[PDB]
Design a protein around this nucleic acid. Structure first.
Ligand SMILES: [Mg+2]
Ligand SMILES: [Mg+2]
Lengths: 311, 318, 319, 310
RNA sequence: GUCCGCAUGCCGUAUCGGGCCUUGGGUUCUAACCUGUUCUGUAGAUUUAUGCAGCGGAC
RNA sequence: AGUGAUAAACCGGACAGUAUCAUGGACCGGUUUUCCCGGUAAUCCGUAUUUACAAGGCUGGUUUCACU
DNA sequence: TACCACCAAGCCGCCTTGTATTATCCCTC
DNA sequence: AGCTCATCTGTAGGCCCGATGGTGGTA
DNA sequence: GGCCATAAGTCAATCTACAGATGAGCT
DNA sequence: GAGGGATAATACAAGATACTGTTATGGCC
């Protein structure tokens, strides 16, 4: 008696498409609002829909409250990568894109593919991720202003200098904020301490890795976490896939340089690939993938980085 | 019910059966009359009576195996290869190969349960073949016409000779097409109906009939318009995304191209066509936009008139 | 007796190529430093090169000190748009060794084209431009943070709010520094006051316009200044067959072009002369942004015209 | 010396004179024998006897006026259109109109002083015309031959009929080309020299002889290879492709025949093969080589000597 | 008829952003091996088609 | 909300082509601090047809109307 | 005298399966 | 505890959204 | 009845010169 | 000695300029 529901989301309104077991549809649109979300649940309970599998695109801020609302109401929620949604529309040979079309498409996606259920993240996991990506935003702004000092006019330098001081101070207090968060929870404190034991990974990288791994082991294999960062190769003469979080992939590049240059186990890996005629950037690409796997490996193991296991 | 996918090449067929229990059977065959008879036997040898075959429309090399299995009594689906590629990308995010194998086609078949393909009538097949041939010679004739305008005098005898040959051959095919449609009572009747529409003549009636066929395969005339790839493609999301509607173009090019010059004639020289043009002109539509719209109109009316079984009644339109 | 010199510039190194009247070349490489600039001038006097025309390409701020050095040495200096150079290279042959432009190619550009002489801008013109460009940079940084408040998480919001306060204060401080600069000079004070008399141009736009028009009248016609902003249409016509619809050329200063867009909306919407303009083009069946595109050009020309006239904006001239 | 620029179209000419003083005179004309006589009279009516005209190679619409002015005694240059466009961009021109481009060609002429154009020999024009026609019919024959692969049975009679017609016509031109070259004693001798090269047959010799004239108009053989667009350039290096396409396309199959079935060709292949070079890359190189050797052999005036490539 | 002046007509779709999602493949089998070119930037340059219409001035 | 009808209305820029142009980098000699004159069928640099061609596949989004 | 919100909002379909050219050597009649 | 150095042809996909300035109108 | 002119026909600025990150080991 | 078949090569992709035809219908002979 499982219903299949699809929800296209916008800032202002939601479009809901219920696909019944019999095969008929029920469609209704709601305000993307706490009130509106309460109406949606009542409307589903209205038609005696208790068992259902809702499917939503991952479009960010505007779809998160309703996903949580329905999850709490006790329905199976799936939050799918939008690129899959696009490919699925093309596979269904659809000739229009509208909100009611999308909602209907998502209900079909849900039925045909039966996606894995979505788990709402832990409030600490959300907190840490928010701080980390904020820290990245400020770093980018600091780097922009540093570039400007190179070719600044003398009348502009007072302004740039002032801003650089502000940004430096802000980055410090936010680094402390991140440290306080991980220290307060005994699990995150332990896991972060493990991550830092890896030579090539320090205070900054550990916090980024921990923001995406979380405080649970959600991946079956370390290789999957490497794929999740978009670091595993793809035949397309193979290239780095880049199908994954950019925040992870940007965070591991300097760790990879420090590893292949300054560490024993890194230099070992660098030397071996260099023998096979691999280029510098190619080796860094490979080491980024390796750091990701070891990071997840070490946490799953639960014991500090053992060098014996490498080289 | 089994779900079977067939990957096809010139020489080899790759087959993948998906059993109700969830296990697979795989086997390769030669893409020949022998290997088709081997394929059917192999299926019966695993007591596979009911199956849904999914083949992708990859040239004409898949045509004889599809007919073989349709005659063997299986449900055959010949799918647009663009759907297959899209299906693979919907199954995974990074995936591998970015190619559609027999296994992927079996999974496509199982999930989507696509509409059953039907082998065309020999006359439908002949008419389509003649129309396609006619369009090829027209394009060659245009190539040679273009050459006359900048030809050197030593080239000109050769070009003129070829133009005469091409003109005579086009004349011969048109007659061959007319003899085809006149002989069958149904095609003779259906071609009259199409030609009753203002803006549709001998050339276009043959092209429309070549794609519509003897039977009424489309439930609605809108679907035939979509089949030609003439409908607008709406692109809307929330408040932010406003994509200006462009013509979809997701359909037969040979059918779409054949309706352009009729659309000009209709909008310029017929009452019902001018009426249509004038209305859209008032709503501030540009020239080719209106032609675009008229092309879709002609497709939709062409199918409509055939279903009605009655000559074009102008009172139905403004 | 005029020589033609091309200088290929890098951050660290200068590459010089003299083309002599007789046709032979003199090449010598220098450091891109105050020392190497005085070395360069001495090397030219070494080869008794008194009258020359020097052609440098506009590749950032690294080429600016050498251009001033040679200008002061008394030579004719031309600073060329690098796109011109690349096109010149392609005009010289169908299968050049490389597409890149070198000092030799710049010397040849100089000889054939005889390009317009470059003048080092007035220290005030420099200063005002610098402040205006800084102001746009902070505005963009402010816009990023203001976009972020839309989707921010609650833990992020203190950090964003703090930054928005800092950027607002800093923007206000620069606007004051710009006003102090134009008010101190009697010519800039007067010229700015004329610009702000145009309905649709206020404090911010007047500063940007001055930053590009400058102290003197360096354009001959108003259309040239409109072209300088990349606002003139781009007509593409040939014979009968080839006829592409006109677009905005966009071949000009982006900072100047971006400054005019919101003024154009204000003018076409809320002013008498602006609505008059909007209606005229609306009658001929023109779209919203197409009219705004047109009004941006109109504003640029009127801005230039008003300054030339030396009198406040008269609305009667536009009817 | 005046500098004149003519922008040509099917129907109209746009003429812009640039006087020594720097003043401009502009006038439009019809692209007809009448309008060409009007043009000369208008130039003579302003006492313009010594001038350098600069036209861009825009189809066969500019060929009549170029010959008219050449005969009138002026210096005519017919420039590669790509150079013209690059020159316009170097002048910073935003707009592109016929009046603008006529002025620009006068300025091109003033600054670049390009090489004078020479009207080709009538035999050279005839041979080029037939060879070009032959390539066209071959392409059409190939199209119909591809259709035979997947032709429905109702279509096959039509395709078979057309293939026979094209095959008959192709022979007729090959015969017409040979009757042309055999009549002229210079063409005949030059063609016999070209065929003496292992890898070059009847087809290729006609194409080469169409682009090389009756006379040796390239100072060096390198230049002829460049003229085909077969010399490399860095952007790793690759074939420039900046030269005659008809000439270039004619050399690919001879290059395969050379590097496979001839001593001097295999020798070349082997050397490069044993230097890490790929198959197509060697073909690319052999295409350039054949072009260079072809012009070399003609200039030497003696049959192909293999000892020179041993 | 020519040469100039135009804050004129005709021709014109600005510039920059923000957020979020991502659970490979092969192998000697998951912290091992094979396959692997991060992420984000910064500064500067741009002089009418006056082409055709108007309107005004000089000849 | 279901059923039935849709040749109506709103949302629409089709396809295919043609011709023409193209005087290397370098290396080796003369003069000569690089101009300019000679030489090259050798060696090094080279992924053709500046898009090579053929065939096949493609069952709208809404609105409106009738009845319950 | 200081604060508010409101003007403008685009565009060149996707896939899959195939093959030719010329000149010289080599085999068959 | 603070500073220096390792990597340099190039080649993810997608679904949502906002700001700019100046002026007439309002408080 | 045969032959012929005619209807429709948009494009997304170009270049050149540059830079930083983080973590571990050494002064 | 003529006449016909076989064969060599295969990540991708990177200038300009000027042009034309299709069909069906109402007018015009
Ligand atoms: Mg959506
Ligand atoms: Mg031209």
């Amino acid at each position: 008696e499982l219903h299949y529901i699809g929800i296209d989301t916008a800032k202002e309104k939601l479009d809901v498409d219920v696909l019944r077991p019999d095969g008929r549809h029920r469609t209704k649109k709601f305000a993307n609002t706490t009130k509106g979300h309460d109406e949606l649940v009542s409307w589903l309970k209205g038609h005696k829909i208790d068992h259902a599998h809702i499917c939503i695109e991952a479009t960010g801020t505007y779809m998160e409250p309703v996903a949580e609302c329905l999850y709490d109401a006790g329905y199976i929620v799936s939050v799918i990568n939008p690129a899959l949604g696009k490919a699925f529309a093309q596979s269904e040979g659809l000739r229009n894109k509208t909100d009611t079309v999308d909602a209907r498409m998502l209900a079909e996606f849900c039925r045909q593919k039966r996606p894995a259920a979505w788990e709402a993240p832990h409030p600490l996991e959300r907190a840490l991720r928010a701080l980390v990506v904020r820290h990245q935003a400020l770093t980018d702004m600091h780097t922009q202003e540093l570039n400007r000092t190179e070719t600044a006019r003398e009348v502009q330098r007072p302004s740039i200098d002032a801003h650089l001081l502000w940004l430096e101070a802000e980055l410090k207090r936010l680094e402390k904020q991140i440290k306080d968060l991980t220290d307060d929870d005994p699990d995150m404190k332990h896991r972060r301490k493990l991550l830092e034991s890896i030579p090539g990974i320090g205070e900054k990288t550990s916090a980024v890795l921990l923001a995406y791994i979380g405080l649970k082991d959600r991946f079956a294999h370390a290789r999957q976490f490497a794929a999740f960062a978009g670091l595993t190769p793809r035949r397309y003469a193979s290239r780095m896939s880049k199908a994954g979080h950019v925040s992870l992939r940007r965070a591991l590049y300097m760790p990879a340089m420090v590893a292949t240059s300054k560490t024993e186990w890194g230099r070992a890996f660098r030397d071996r690939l260099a023998a096979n005629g691999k280029k510098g950037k190619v080796i860094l690409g490979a080491m980024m993938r390796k750091l990701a796997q070891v990071a997840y490996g070490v946490l799953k193991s639960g014991v500090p980085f053992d060098a014996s296991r490498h080289n």
